[PDB]
Amino acid sequence: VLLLDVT
Amino acid sequence: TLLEEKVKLEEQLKETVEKYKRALADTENLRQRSQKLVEEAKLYGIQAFCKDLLEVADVLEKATQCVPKEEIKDDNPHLKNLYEGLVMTEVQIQKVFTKHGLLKLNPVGAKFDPYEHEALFHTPVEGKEPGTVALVSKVGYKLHGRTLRPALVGVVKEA
Amino acid sequence: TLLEEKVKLEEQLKETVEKYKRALADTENLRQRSQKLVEEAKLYGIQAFCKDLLEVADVLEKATQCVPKEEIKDDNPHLKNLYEGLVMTEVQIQKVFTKHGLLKLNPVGAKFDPYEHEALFHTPVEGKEPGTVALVSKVGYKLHGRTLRPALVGVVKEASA
Amino acid sequence: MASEAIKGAVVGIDLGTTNSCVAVMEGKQAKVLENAEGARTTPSVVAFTADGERLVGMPAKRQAVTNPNNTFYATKRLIGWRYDDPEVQKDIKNVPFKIVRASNGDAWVEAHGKLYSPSQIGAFVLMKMKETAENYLGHTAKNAVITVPAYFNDSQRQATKDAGQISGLNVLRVINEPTAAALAYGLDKSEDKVIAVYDLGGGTFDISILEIQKGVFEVKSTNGDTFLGGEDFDQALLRHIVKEFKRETGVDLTKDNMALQRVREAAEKAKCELSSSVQTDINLPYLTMDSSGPKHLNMKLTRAQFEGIVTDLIRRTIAPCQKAMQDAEVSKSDIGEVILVGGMTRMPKVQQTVQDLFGRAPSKAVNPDEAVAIGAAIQGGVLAGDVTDVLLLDVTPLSLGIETLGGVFTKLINRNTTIPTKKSQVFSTAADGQTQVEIKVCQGEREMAGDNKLLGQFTLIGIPPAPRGVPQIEVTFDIDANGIVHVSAKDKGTGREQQIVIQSSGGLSKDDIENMVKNAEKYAEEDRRKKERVEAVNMAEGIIHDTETKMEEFKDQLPADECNKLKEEISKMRELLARKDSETGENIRQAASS
């Protein structure tokens, strides 16, 4: 449910 | 007819004031980002300088520690004068390093820290706690609190 | 009052439109100046550190010069090892110096340039072209074309005759 | 007349007797510009060579020895004065260069058979400083605000205006140095007050008593010591050091030249160090070379010794200040603020003298060395264009952002960002098959999820199934007008948007800006370390998930018992004693080839 981050 | 001018002028004035405030805020944020970029460039330059500066101090300190302290006597005036000058020079070097954020790492007896210390070897030592720096093979350095070069330490093991 | 108020408000609208145009011009100028400042800070920025270590470099050179070099013998082995360590330290500091753009200025016989040289005396010297550097008391340094420390020189003067 | 329509950049130039400083308005604060040699302060020295040159600054100082009769320094003591004047008659004897009388009976100078007024030397200095400003700016600096001492009469102020005009500068106004210092210290927007400007450190000591009645500055009185400056303190320290060295060894450094320069620099650094530290050491290896061997100087200098060395010089600043208060018709209780200007005022002894003399602890929140130029820049920014509009532009108090899979605090908008700003960033889904995306908005300065605050929280429901990392969600903050934050989450490609209008956008306006960032700097390297730890944990978990998924795809004739490095990776995961797991992330082996 936690947003990810674009690498 | 003439009343339409009021509505048009009010709408245009509000739109233009919004655009002008947003454009006057864009330049300030760009200025702060540019300041951050310049600070990053300065920090990188100083870090790259210090990384190769460390070898000079290492060589000087090794040279001045090789000479035994029992032979710095008055019947060898040239060795005594050179030793005094060189120890004063490395004190000057370390003072200059400290002034510019570069701090030494000599954790004699301090608890082990993977972010500052590197375990060259593991060997139990009597009278010392486990996971504690019994001997420092090579001195480390810190730049603004971040480890520029980890110290090569000896970690006490369990016997 | 309605018409004059409308005219004044339209004037204010045009003024703030010009203000918005000025803001766009200002942010473009800021982009250009920022791209300049980043390169400037990449070249320099070790200027303070270099200016602080200049005296260490000079002290190491003076230490190399001061030892009489007649006592560097196998009879005195600990003074020999210390001298070799000092020599290695001097070459190391000069190798890291030139790696980061810090170059030494030693104008033995160059023309006096009051941008990298600080004249110490104006003594006349025979056989030397007037205006040249007679001797360099202390070597100067510069990094990337920025004169950190001037070379303390002595300029020659025309013969009084 | 109507608005002059300056529409340009106004520089603030501090034209000093010895050293000049230039600054510009960099938005809401003034910035002191460094010259072509990277120094923030340029000497007010001009020189002319045999054929023709105009060396200004340190190039003129370096050449001064070779050209002593054509190097003009401290010409600001000749500006606005006639040739037949007492002070000019005292000054002409000492100066190596030639001082002549003009047709109008004014004290001019001569250089290779050419006549320059004392305003023209300042014009050359101002040309150099305008070039310095333009190099940083990138465009021409047409307008300027030039500072003069408070004891200048109208003739000398007009001479300064003419000097500025000669340099191609549109001098908006000629300001005082006490008024510029007050503007830099921020007393322009203050109630009616009487303030004292303590100026010690230059080539002169100046004390001016000011009044800020009605919102404008009036100079009630002026005084000081003409032959007292910051060079005398350094000279006293250097004399003490060389006397101690001769006493301890027996060699006088005055005859030596290189050693004297080394000791002078060491004394300057030692004096600068005895303002924050009680004690200091002066180490100078190989100071002098004798027939008996080199001599190394090693001195221990404490603050008590230093403040006893220069006690007479500091005491020489008590009579002028008392006389200045007498001229202003004020007492200790009538002074509402004390302002410290000059580099010599950083020692606690000078500040203690000022406090004992005016009854008020001096204001030391501004760099005294660059206060006049900064105040001139502030005044220039106020006078022309629109700088107050950027002054009323409210900025965010604390940084803002959203959550992250590994508990990281992803910073969209940083701390000191002007409020009417929109910033957007695109983020992917957490895991494969994930359809629900939740945004956790929080404010602070630490690099952790829940370690700062929690403003609001919403959910983006409805996402087509896709492999992890492929869906793109554009989280955008829409801080608009002044205040409230319009956080919105956008699912790029499809619909089902979300929004929130979270309040308390710095509503608790207090010293949290001063304290929350105070402990966010001390607890920074540890915070960075734990953030890097969690980033490595996330990367290793993703790699192991990819490896497991690829392994469960190919099973037949697969002797991958050697491919059990994931066991070692998991063992490393359950260990809070390692720097990072990036180095052991080499577990992406795909010898099976799908």
Residue numbers in the entry:
A (entry chain D): 435 to 441
B (entry chain C): 59 to 217
C (entry chain B): 59 to 219
D (entry chain A): 46 to 639
Original paper wording:
In bacteria, mitochondria, and chloroplasts, the GrpE-family of NEFs interacts with substrate-bound Hsp70 to facilitate ADP and protein substrate release. Herein, we present structures of full-length human mortalin in a nucleotide-free and substrate-bound state in complex with full-length GrpEL1. To stabilize the complex for structural analysis, we introduced a point mutation, R126W, into mortalin (mortalinR126W) that is associated with EVEN-PLUS syndrome and has been shown to reduce mortalin’s ATPase activity and conformational flexibility.
Further refinement yielded a 2.96 Å resolution cryoEM map describing a complex consisting of full-length mortalinR126W bound to a protein substrate and a full-length GrpEL1 homodimer. Firstly, we observe an expanded NBD devoid of nucleotide that is mediated by extensive contacts with one protomer of GrpEL1, termed GrpEL1-A. Secondly, we detail the significant bending of the GrpEL1 α-helical stalk domain that enables interactions between the GrpEL1 stalk and mortalinR126W NBD and SBD. Finally, this structure provides insights into the interactions between the SBDα helical lid of mortalin and the second GrpEL1 protomer, GrpEL1-B. Critically, the lack of EM density within the nucleotide-binding pocket but strong density within the substrate-binding pocket suggests that our structure represents a previously unobserved intermediate state and suggests a step-wise mechanism for the nucleotide and substrate release action of GrpEL1. At the first interface, subdomain IB of the NBD contacts the β-wing domain of GrpEL1-A via a salt bridge between R107 in mortalinR126W and the carbonyl group of P172 in GrpEL1-A. Here, the mortalinR126W IDL is proximal to the GrpEL1 α-helical dimer with residues V435 and L438 within the hydrophobic IDL interacting with L82 in GrpEL1-B. Compared to the predicted GrpEL1 structure, our mortalinR126W-GrpEL1 structure exhibits a ~ 13° bending of the GrpEL1 α-helical domain. We observed strong density for a peptide bound to the SBD substrate binding pocket, indicating that our purified complex is substrate-bound. With these factors in mind, combined with Hsp70’s propensity to bind hydrophobic peptides, we modeled the bound peptide as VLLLDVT, corresponding to residues 435–441 of mortalin’s IDL region, into our cryoEM density.
